[PDB]
RNA sequence: AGGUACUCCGGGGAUAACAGGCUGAUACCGCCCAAGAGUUCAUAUCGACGGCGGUGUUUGGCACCUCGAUGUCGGCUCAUCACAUCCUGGGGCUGAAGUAGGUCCCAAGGGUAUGGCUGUUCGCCAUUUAAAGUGGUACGCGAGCUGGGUUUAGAACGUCGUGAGACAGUUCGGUCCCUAUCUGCCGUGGGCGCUGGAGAACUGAGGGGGGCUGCUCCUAGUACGAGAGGACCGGAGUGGACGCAUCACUGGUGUUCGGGUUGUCAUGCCAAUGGCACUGCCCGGUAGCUAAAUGCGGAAGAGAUAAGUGCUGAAAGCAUCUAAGCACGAAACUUGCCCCGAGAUGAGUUCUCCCUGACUCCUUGAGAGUCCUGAAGGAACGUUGAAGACGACGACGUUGAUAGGCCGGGUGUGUAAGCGCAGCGAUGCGUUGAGCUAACCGGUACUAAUGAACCGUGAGGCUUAACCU
RNA sequence: CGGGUAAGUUCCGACCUGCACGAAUGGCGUAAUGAUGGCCAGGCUGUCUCCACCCGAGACUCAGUGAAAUUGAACUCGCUGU
RNA sequence: UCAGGUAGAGAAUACCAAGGCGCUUGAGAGAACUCGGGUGAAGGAACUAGGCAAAAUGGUGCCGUAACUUCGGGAGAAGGCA
RNA sequence: GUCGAGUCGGCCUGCGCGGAAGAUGUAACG
RNA sequence: CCGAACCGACUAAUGUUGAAAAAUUAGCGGAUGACUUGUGGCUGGGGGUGAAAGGCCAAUCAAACCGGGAGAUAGCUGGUU
RNA sequence: GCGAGGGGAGUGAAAAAGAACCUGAAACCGUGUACGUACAAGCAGUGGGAGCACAGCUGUGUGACUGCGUACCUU
């Protein structure tokens, strides 16, 4: 049973999952749109959108939290200097997912995920 | 959740004093022996607190007549007549289960000055 | 929560120091004895000139347990060890004359009133 | 564990009576580009619900 | 004696003044609305059909809406029947409230138990496990033997095996009625009842009593 | 003349060891006669000398099946039946005062120990229990587990033998394979049917589950008894074991939350952080799942009975429970309780909803085709769920709280960072119960749930009644 | 027979009635040594009472590739009998 | 044959350098059951042929250490403190 | 003594009754 | 003596149409010696070699492998249009 | 896909003689049509037999329902 549980295992262990979404969150902030599998995209929302919410309040402590969660200073700078202000009046929902068919190699269901003002 | 909130709010005590893990508290509980009702004191260190609304509880540890005893009180129970802090303790942890392996000098808790 | 093979301390001055439960009395397949339950015991350690000897088989009433007792409001009382009071195998009256440490109100019955009266504290 | 008797071609077909594929019920038509597409998916040219959502 | 349809709100406790904590299941019983009365002449048996709660119009089909409209009542979230005793009478469109239980001491509560999915024999039927060690090969939670030998040469019907567990109708009998609160549409029964929070419950006066 | 357990080939179920079969001497269980025992008294209880059966349970006889293989003793797991009944229920007789027994009859609903020793089954012992039943099921169960014993190859002792070797003598060591086609069984779907289509609520043929019991108290120290002792009947409470549900409480888990900390590498460095070391090691803990947690259950009642007890009553002027007639009588039976259930093809009922076009051809009929039409509803797709292996089932799709985010709260952890102060410094203190906080609660259209398209039709056979036209 | 255990067909100490020990196919002892055989205790624990939860890899679904033993023929049910 | 850094007695071990790699099916899901692991209330060998497996102990310095002995041992006995 | 027409128990013989408990399911007329 | 490399193989689980015709994983023994290892040499089938298990002598051992006597013989089993 | 493979064109008496090449059997696997088949229990046939389709009352195909019916070899 998994009654009321949240989060996808994605056939990984916990440290792999955490590292993967740290990399993928960085790619989405950097490129503003990426293509990935539909389940990974849905999981990425719960990682990236709290980072943008954090970036709405610029302070030393918040930059350090964001650095702790991304480990990339170029990503932290873009979060606080660009994305935070771009989304300052939006109450959540900073990303959108667009389904785009099936991967050739393994028939995986694919999707684009982008920032909503891209 | 408003229905159960209303049912729980009307039963909650309004005079529970503030206390922390590490404090020494005295709890007065009702004891019935036949037709008579009287208050019995239980005084010791608060080693755990469960904050859960009407279901709040706290655990008090004492060494009584050569034996360690723990009592888990249900905070809003009418069996508990009153609670009072005798001494304020200075600890770091929320739960002081490590005191179960300590006696005498090793089980002392520094006083919290404030 | 006492079962066969559980070792218990002795809360009296009968002379026994350590006893082992060898039967939970009072029912087929009965698993556990708690506070206020009668068990069969064997004496595993005794003081030299006491009233009972190592290897004796007799009865006892459990008076303190680590699992504890629940009260009608949901509260719990737990002790640091398991302890019992030795009883005569036939009359089920205590063998010692003194009781050590606290006991609980679960003993407040006609059968164990002597224990209640001798105890230094009843919780 | 293994069969004692060779199953027949009839029984083989009966087992496969649930294997047939199902065609897509119907495709959707983009209101701007007129492309057909899987419903709730973008078109081959990058439209969704009439908006050019992605380049190429 | 008829029952009422309610909703499992959750569990809590009622402290009494004498120091007892009573665990209770909180059941919300909104007004049950009589949608059809069945009788011997037309239906061969005596019962009422009730509805309760509310339903959004665009999820009410035309066959359902016409049935509610004939009774003159607003659509509820479902329909349930209760057989009538010999001296019981109701009329279509009548509302029945939780005050029905005002003087009822004990009730039976029926619900759909929580779903455990596919369950093994240890959990489903309380089978004992085999050795964790002492040489056991791949057979720690498995069922063991399932029959005899050449006689009878088959497995008997009703053999206890793994399969779906829970998610089925269950009745718990003879629960104390702790409080009837008609102003808040509340029924408080002592103890637990089947089903998850939010699920439908059927409450009737206890059959054993 | 011998050995082979270091072994080998050709054969045999022509022929043994296991299990089946036939048989029933033997075994076990009934019964008949009644010498006697029992103060008297054959029959309360035993029953000598002898007699007659039943079972298929023992030890055996036979050699019919299997030697181109039907794996063994014991344990473990899971059972199922019989009744010659161990407990509980009902009863007759007693050498039955009571309590407690003896013996026989009825009764198979449910229940029916844990340990020490030994490979043990068994048995003895310790301590329980209402009781610790007897048997059948390949001495039930190794394509379910074990492998201690028996029964390969190593080695030794006693013993036998000149010796190789041997011994249901002993001793230490010694590979247990199989991905389930069919039957069966547990679950879960798809198809078509049920006669116009569709959405619901049902009826209940039939099936399954459940059915155990202790102790204390009252009745009552009453009845009984010289005392010692000590009830029936009836009532109340509280347990054991078992079962179902649940998570409010008490707790476990909680690699998705917070903190402490060792070694090391990195982010330029300080400070702050991250990676790796079993989650590095640990301390706490939310939701969920859960037992040790806490609610509930076994029934009462009814019907027809078993053994047994009777009423009235002749045959047979009496007597007689029986022949006619009438009445009691048990956990067994049929119900009552819970669940499934119309594929119940004997395919049932009730409520509601929907469809009221045109034409042509033919072999002329429950015929075929084209045009127009496309309902109720369904499905699909999407967002999903204390629903779930997949199907299925439930919620929701902008006329929207379905999921994520967001806002507020709760909970958990336990006073973040930065700055300042004190101290030589480790560190302490202030800002500060701070900061962070999953699955929780209450809100909120910010994101994603698209207009459509698809399936499903167009008033529903014949015959005969009844009623009206 | 004694010891150990509530209880000990094993173990230890004895007795001698050695079925069928016995002196280099050596007798009786023996400190140390042994992945050697037997027995007991402290610690320790999911071995067990009695299992619960969790993390991973399979099992399950989708896409790609794609085996095996076996097989007289099958329209391959229960029971009681034969 | 060669043998860097930090910790370390070390060529053990942990994390790294130079250098080299992610192991030639993937994507989901988050049932039973199997495999490899983590934690567990109360009890603590009751398990079993047998404590099998697991849990546990574990370093350095110092204090201290019995029977027995072939005088070497036994001995890191045991136990304890920092 | 009353009561007023049958009564009693051997033998042989036909058919029946009890004696009569078993294991997956009626299951000892197919 | 403790313990890596190196040489072994006591226990358990897995695996048993294996990743492997003897392994993997966690533990285990020896580890300056009757030690271990490279290269080359020698011993030949009733023969070798053997700290001895009938062990080993190319995945073969109570008498190796290959070819020949050879279509050994088969009072046995199968089959025979 | 500057593929594989194929369709045309052309050669030839013939290309279902196209190089995976004379003939091209059987097992085995398909597409199309006719009839049967979703209340029915077993060596699957045989005797009886309705209905439907087809070709000219008959011939062919199918076979509802029903009596009977446990393969072959060896030993
Ligand atoms: K269960
Ligand atoms: K010979
Ligand atoms: K031999
Ligand atoms: K016989
Ligand atoms: K016989
Ligand atoms: K008899
Ligand atoms: K044989
Ligand atoms: K049995
Ligand atoms: K009885
Ligand atoms: K009797
Ligand atoms: K019975
Ligand atoms: K043993
Ligand atoms: K024996
Ligand atoms: K057998
Ligand atoms: K086996
Ligand atoms: K066996
Ligand atoms: K078998
Ligand atoms: K079969
Ligand atoms: K039944
Ligand atoms: K809980
Ligand atoms: K919890
Ligand atoms: K670090
Ligand atoms: K009479
Ligand atoms: K129907
Ligand atoms: K939301
Ligand atoms: K601070
Ligand atoms: K601070
Ligand atoms: K806080
Ligand atoms: K000699
Ligand atoms: K000597
Ligand atoms: K050894
Ligand atoms: K030894
Ligand atoms: K390392
Ligand atoms: K799955
Ligand atoms: K050398
Ligand atoms: K040799
Ligand atoms: K060779
Ligand atoms: K030779
Ligand atoms: K040709
Ligand atoms: K061909
Ligand atoms: K036929
Ligand atoms: K043959
Ligand atoms: K033969
Ligand atoms: Mg959720
Ligand atoms: Mg995978
Ligand atoms: Mg890690
Ligand atoms: Mg066969
Ligand atoms: Mg298929
Ligand atoms: Mg579920
Ligand atoms: Mg068990
Ligand atoms: Mg194995
Ligand atoms: Mg295993
Ligand atoms: Mg030998
Ligand atoms: Mg042979
Ligand atoms: Mg035999
Ligand atoms: Mg026999
Ligand atoms: Mg024969
Ligand atoms: Mg013969
Ligand atoms: Mg046979
Ligand atoms: Mg064979
Ligand atoms: Mg067989
Ligand atoms: Mg009987
Ligand atoms: Mg019966
Ligand atoms: Mg009954
Ligand atoms: Mg022992
Ligand atoms: Mg033993
Ligand atoms: Mg057997
Ligand atoms: Mg048996
Ligand atoms: Mg078998
Ligand atoms: Mg197996
Ligand atoms: Mg063995
Ligand atoms: Mg060995
Ligand atoms: Mg096996
Ligand atoms: Mg269906
Ligand atoms: Mg039943
Ligand atoms: Mg809760
Ligand atoms: Mg907790
Ligand atoms: Mg934890
Ligand atoms: Mg630093
Ligand atoms: Mg690194
Ligand atoms: Mg590394
Ligand atoms: Mg009754
Ligand atoms: Mg008469
Ligand atoms: Mg009863
Ligand atoms: Mg389902
Ligand atoms: Mg807090
Ligand atoms: Mg910090
Ligand atoms: Mg918050
Ligand atoms: Mg003895
Ligand atoms: Mg002894
Ligand atoms: Mg001896
Ligand atoms: Mg000798
Ligand atoms: Mg000799
Ligand atoms: Mg001599
Ligand atoms: Mg000699
Ligand atoms: Mg000699
Ligand atoms: Mg010697
Ligand atoms: Mg050695
Ligand atoms: Mg596949
Ligand atoms: Mg059969
Ligand atoms: Mg180094
Ligand atoms: Mg290394
Ligand atoms: Mg799953
Ligand atoms: Mg898993
Ligand atoms: Mg496991
Ligand atoms: Mg562990
Ligand atoms: Mg534990
Ligand atoms: Mg803990
Ligand atoms: Mg513990
Ligand atoms: Mg212990
Ligand atoms: Mg034992
Ligand atoms: Mg045992
Ligand atoms: Mg071990
Ligand atoms: Mg370990
Ligand atoms: Mg050391
Ligand atoms: Mg007769
Ligand atoms: Mg029967
Ligand atoms: Mg070797
Ligand atoms: Mg190894
Ligand atoms: Mg050594
Ligand atoms: Mg060494
Ligand atoms: Mg030669
Ligand atoms: Mg030999
Ligand atoms: Mg070889
Ligand atoms: Mg030879
Ligand atoms: Mg010749
Ligand atoms: Mg030849
Ligand atoms: Mg070409
Ligand atoms: Mg030619
Ligand atoms: Mg050709
Ligand atoms: Mg062909
Ligand atoms: Mg039928
Ligand atoms: Mg049909
Ligand atoms: Mg069939
Ligand atoms: Mg026939």
């Amino acid at each position: 049973m998994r009654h009321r549980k949240s989060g996808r295992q994605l056939n990984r262990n916990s440290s792999h999952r955490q590292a993967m979404f740290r990399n993928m969150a960085g790619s989405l902030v950097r490129h503003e749109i990426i293509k990935t599998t539909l389940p990974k995209a849905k999981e990425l929302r719960r990682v990236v959108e709290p980072l943008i919410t954090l970036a709405k309040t610029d302070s030393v402590a918040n930059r350090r939290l964001a650095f702790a969660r991304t480990r990339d200073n170029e990503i932290v700078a873009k979060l606080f200097n660009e994305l935070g202000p771009r989304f300052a009046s939006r109450a959540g929902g900073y990303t959108r997912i667009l389904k785009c068919g099936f991967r050739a190699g393994d028939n995986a269901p694919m999707a684009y995920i982008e920032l909503v003002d891209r | 959740s408003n229905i159960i909130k209303q049912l729980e709010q009307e039963q909650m005590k309004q005079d529970v004093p503030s206390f922390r893990p590490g404090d020494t508290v005295e709890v007065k509980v009702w004891v019935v022996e036949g037709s008579k009702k009287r208050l019995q004191a239980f005084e010791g260190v608060v080693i755990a607190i469960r904050n859960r609304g009407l279901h709040s509880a706290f655990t008090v540890r004492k060494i009584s007549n050569g034996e360690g005893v723990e009592r888990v009180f249900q905070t809003h129970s009418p069996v508990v007549d009153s609670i009072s802090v005798k001494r304020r303790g200075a600890v770091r942890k929320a739960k002081l289960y490590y005191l179960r392996e300590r006696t005498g000098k090793a089980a002392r808790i520094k006083e919290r000055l404030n | 929560m006492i079962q066969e093979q559980t070792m218990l301390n002795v809360a009296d001055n009968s002379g026994a120091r350590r006893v082992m439960c060898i039967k939970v009395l009072g029912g087929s397949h009965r698993r556990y004895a708690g506070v206020g339950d009668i068990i069969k015991i064997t004496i595993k350690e005794a003081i030299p000139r006491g009233k009972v000897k190592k290897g004796d088989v007799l009865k006892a009433v459990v008076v303190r347990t680590k699992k504890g007792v629940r009260r009608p409001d949901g509260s719990v009382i737990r002790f640091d060890g398991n302890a019992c009071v030795l009883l005569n195998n036939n009359s089920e009256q205590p063998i010692g004359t003194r009781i050590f440490g606290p006991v609980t109100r679960e003993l407040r019955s006609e059968k164990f009133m002597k224990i209640i009266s001798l105890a230094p504290e009843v919780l | 564990a293994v069969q004692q008797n060779k199953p027949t071609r009839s029984k083989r077909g009966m087992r496969r009576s649930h294997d047939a594929l199902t065609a897509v019920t119907s495709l959707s038509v983009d209101k701007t580009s007129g492309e057909k597409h899987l419903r709730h998916h973008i078109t081959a040219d990058g439209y969704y619900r009439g908006r050019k959502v992605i380049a190429k | 004696m008829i029952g009422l349809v309610g909703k499992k709100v959750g569990m809590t406790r009622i402290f009494t003044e004498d120091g007892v904590s009573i665990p209770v299941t909180v059941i919300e019983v909104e007004a049950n609305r009589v949608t059809q009365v069945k009788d011997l002449a037309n239906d061969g048996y005596r019962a009422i059909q009730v509805t309760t709660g509310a339903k959004k119009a665009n999820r009410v089909t035309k066959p359902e809406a016409g049935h509610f409209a004939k009774a003159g009542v607003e659509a509820g979230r479902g329909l349930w029947e209760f057989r009538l005793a010999e001296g019981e009478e109701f009329t279509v469109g009548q509302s029945i409230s939780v005050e029905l239980f005002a003087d009822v001491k004990k009730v039976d509560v029926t619900g759909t138990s929580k779903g455990k999915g596919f369950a093994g024999t240890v959990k489903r039927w309380n089978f004992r496990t085999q050795d964790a060690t002492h040489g056991n090969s791949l057979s720690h939670r498995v069922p063991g033997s399932i029959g005899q030998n050449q006689t009878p040469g088959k497995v008997f019907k009703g053999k206890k095996m793994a399969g779906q567990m829970g998610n089925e109708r269950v009745t718990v009998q003879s629960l104390d009625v702790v409080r009837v609160d008609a102003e808040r549409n509340l029924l408080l029964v002592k103890g637990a009842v089947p089903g998850a929070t939010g699920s439908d419950l059927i409450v009737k006066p206890a059959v054993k009593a």
Side-chain angles (χ1 to χ4, degrees):
Chain A
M1 300 166 265
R2 56 149 290 289
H3 291 174
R4 313 274 274 178
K5 296 191 184 191
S6 265
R8 290 178 166 88
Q9 194 212 305
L10 297 170
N11 295 276
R12 285 163 169 83
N13 57 46
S14 195
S15 64
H16 189 173
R17 267 197 311 280
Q18 192 186 309
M20 187 184 57
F21 284 122
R22 188 180 294 179
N23 287 329
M24 192 183 297
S27 305
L28 178 55
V29 165
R30 171 180 284 113
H31 303 292
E32 308 213 358
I33 175 165
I34 63 173
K35 192 196 233 191
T36 192
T37 72
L38 179 62
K40 281 182 193 94
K42 294 196 170 173
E43 285 298 293
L44 185 61
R45 290 179 307 180
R46 317 189 46 230
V47 176
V48 168
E49 300 198 354
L51 283 174
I52 286 157
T53 297
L54 180 63
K56 286 183 194 192
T57 306
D58 195 347
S59 72
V60 164
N62 281 351
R63 296 219 181 205
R64 295 195 177 178
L65 291 184
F67 185 66
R69 285 159 196 187
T70 67
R71 298 302 297 188
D72 193 323
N73 276 319
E74 185 203 338
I75 296 304
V76 172
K78 174 152 184 194
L79 273 172
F80 285 82
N81 298 330
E82 313 192 16
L83 293 197
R86 263 161 62 175
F87 291 125
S89 73
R90 187 173 291 265
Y94 320 109
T95 65
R96 72 159 52 84
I97 296 172
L98 301 134
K99 296 178 267 296
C100 62
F102 304 85
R103 191 147 70 180
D106 57 3
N107 200 45
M110 300 306 280
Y112 286 103
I113 178 163
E114 64 169 357
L115 307 177
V116 288
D117 67 354
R118 186 196 50 109
Chain B
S1 76
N2 63 288
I3 293 155
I4 282 186
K5 179 190 133 29
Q6 192 282 309
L7 288 166
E8 291 182 352
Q9 276 291 327
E10 63 185 342
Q11 312 186 72
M12 276 176 82
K13 290 174 183 173
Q14 301 304 303
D15 72 328
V16 185
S18 54
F19 53 92
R20 280 171 72 153
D23 291 349
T24 300
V25 298
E26 191 197 50
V27 186
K28 294 274 181 51
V29 302
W30 286 110
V31 162
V32 179
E33 307 146 305
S35 160
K36 331 184 54 64
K37 253 182 46 203
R38 59 174 192 95
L39 291 176
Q40 191 188 58
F42 190 93
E43 166 179 305
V45 183
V46 179
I47 63 171
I49 297 174
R50 180 174 195 261
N51 302 295
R52 229 53 66 93
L54 183 72
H55 311 302
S56 298
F58 62 106
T59 306
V60 182
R61 176 165 175 90
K62 73 173 282 192
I63 312 298
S64 152
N65 286 276
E67 293 293 330
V69 192
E70 286 173 25
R71 190 143 176 184
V72 179
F73 294 102
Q74 315 282 266
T75 308
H76 299 282
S77 171
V79 171
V80 173
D81 193 61
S82 72
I83 307 163
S84 68
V85 179
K86 289 339 195 179
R87 173 190 189 260
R88 307 194 297 150
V91 298
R92 307 285 296 268
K93 286 179 183 321
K95 306 291 197 284
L96 310 179
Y97 303 139
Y98 62 90
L99 292 175
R100 291 168 179 158
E101 319 313 329
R102 284 154 187 238
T103 67
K105 299 281 188 168
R108 291 175 294 168
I109 291 147
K110 175 182 46 124
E111 182 163 52
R112 191 172 82 249
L113 314 176
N114 260 290
Chain C
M1 221 180 140
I2 310 302
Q3 61 181 268
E4 276 176 46
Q5 315 293 324
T6 300
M7 299 285 319
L8 298 100
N9 302 302
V10 182
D12 64 36
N13 65 344
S14 66
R17 298 272 270 243
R18 301 280 282 159
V19 304
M20 195 181 78
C21 170
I22 66 168
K23 193 68 64 185
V24 175
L25 301 169
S28 177
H29 291 89
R30 187 176 175 155
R31 285 185 184 87
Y32 313 109
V35 169
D37 293 333
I38 307 291
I39 54 172
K40 200 83 180 197
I41 53 149
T42 181
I43 296 169
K44 294 299 199 182
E45 193 212 314
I47 64 157
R49 274 154 306 268
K51 295 174 194 112
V52 293
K53 309 244 156 293
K54 176 165 169 284
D56 285 356
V57 173
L58 63 158
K59 280 167 192 190
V61 52
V62 179
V63 301
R64 290 190 289 271
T65 59
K66 286 192 98 277
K67 199 61 154 74
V69 299
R70 313 263 327 253
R71 290 293 164 80
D73 68 341
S75 65
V76 194
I77 305 166
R78 307 186 287 258
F79 299 93
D80 270 358
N82 306 300
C84 64
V85 163
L86 271 58
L87 304 178
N88 175 280
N89 188 92
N90 283 111
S91 70
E92 301 181 346
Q93 284 309 97
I95 289 179
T97 58
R98 300 233 281 125
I99 298 292
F100 303 119
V103 306
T104 73
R105 242 161 272 291
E106 279 72 15
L107 302 184
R108 278 191 79 82
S109 66
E110 70 294 318
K111 208 155 175 20
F112 308 117
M113 257 312 147
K114 160 151 313 299
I115 296 176
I116 283 283
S117 77
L118 294 170
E121 183 178 2
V122 182
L123 299 177
Chain D
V2 71
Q3 66 202 23
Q4 287 201 356
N5 291 106
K6 177 192 189 172
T8 62
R9 53 177 68 76
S10 159
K11 282 330 176 77
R12 174 185 71 214
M14 284 171 187
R15 178 176 60 255
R16 299 180 183 177
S17 80
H18 302 282
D19 289 358
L21 312 175
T22 71
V24 161
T25 291
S26 77
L27 302 170
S28 305
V29 186
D30 185 72
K31 68 166 172 180
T32 288
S33 80
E35 289 184 89
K36 295 190 262 72
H37 64 98
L38 258 201
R39 194 158 191 78
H40 301 101
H41 297 231
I42 70 177
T43 70
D45 292 347
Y47 281 77
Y48 186 52
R49 289 174 68 174
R51 154 164 101 90
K52 178 85 167 172
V53 278
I54 90 164
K56 84 285 190 162
Chain E
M1 194 284 204
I2 60 145
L4 300 171
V5 183
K7 187 168 61 62
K8 183 170 176 170
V9 172
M11 308 207 36
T12 187
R13 81 221 282 178
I14 299 291
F15 287 117
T16 74
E17 55 281 64
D18 82 303
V20 172
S21 185
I22 307 165
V24 298
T25 300
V26 181
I27 308 177
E28 173 170 63
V29 182
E30 294 163 18
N32 288 202
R33 272 122 47 206
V34 178
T35 54
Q36 185 175 3
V37 179
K38 296 185 177 184
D39 59 43
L40 287 186
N42 182 67
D43 296 271
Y45 74 105
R46 289 185 71 242
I48 52 163
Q49 185 196 71
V50 303
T51 199
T52 196
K55 214 198 183 135
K56 58 168 75 212
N58 73 15
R59 295 256 172 206
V60 178
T61 63
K62 286 176 70 37
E64 287 155 11
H67 181 70
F68 285 121
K70 193 195 163 152
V73 309
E74 327 85 89
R77 63 179 193 262
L79 300 168
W80 298 261
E81 279 192 30
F82 294 93
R83 302 284 287 261
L84 293 174
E86 213 46 272
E88 257 175 320
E89 321 283 323
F90 299 87
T91 61
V92 172
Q94 172 180 351
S95 273
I96 315 165
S97 84
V98 76
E99 267 302 88
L100 184 84
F101 291 117
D103 313 297
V104 170
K105 291 331 276 145
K106 293 194 185 163
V107 291
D108 300 332
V109 178
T110 300
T112 304
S113 65
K114 288 176 136 183
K116 312 298 163 88
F118 199 98
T121 46
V122 166
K123 176 186 183 68
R124 183 172 188 213
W125 295 116
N126 311 328
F127 283 16
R128 312 172 168 92
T129 67
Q130 304 181 51
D131 293 322
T133 61
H134 291 294
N136 184 292
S137 305
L138 310 178
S139 303
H140 305 291
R141 293 176 79 86
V142 305
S145 183
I146 66 176
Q148 292 82 42
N149 202 314
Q150 172 162 182
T151 302
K154 71 179 183 173
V155 175
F156 290 133
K157 273 208 219 311
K159 178 82 187 72
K160 292 175 175 177
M161 303 183 137
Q164 168 75 30
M165 182 186 181
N167 195 35
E168 75 193 337
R169 181 183 173 109
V170 174
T171 294
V172 180
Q173 290 187 313
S174 304
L175 300 189
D176 282 342
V177 174
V178 173
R179 181 182 305 165
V180 181
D181 190 10
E183 312 70 358
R184 299 183 196 279
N185 297 323
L186 290 191
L187 175 74
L188 266 48
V189 303
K190 177 182 174 181
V193 309
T197 297
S199 66
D200 296 332
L201 301 172
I202 307 289
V203 185
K204 316 214 262 283
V207 66
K208 304 246 177 104

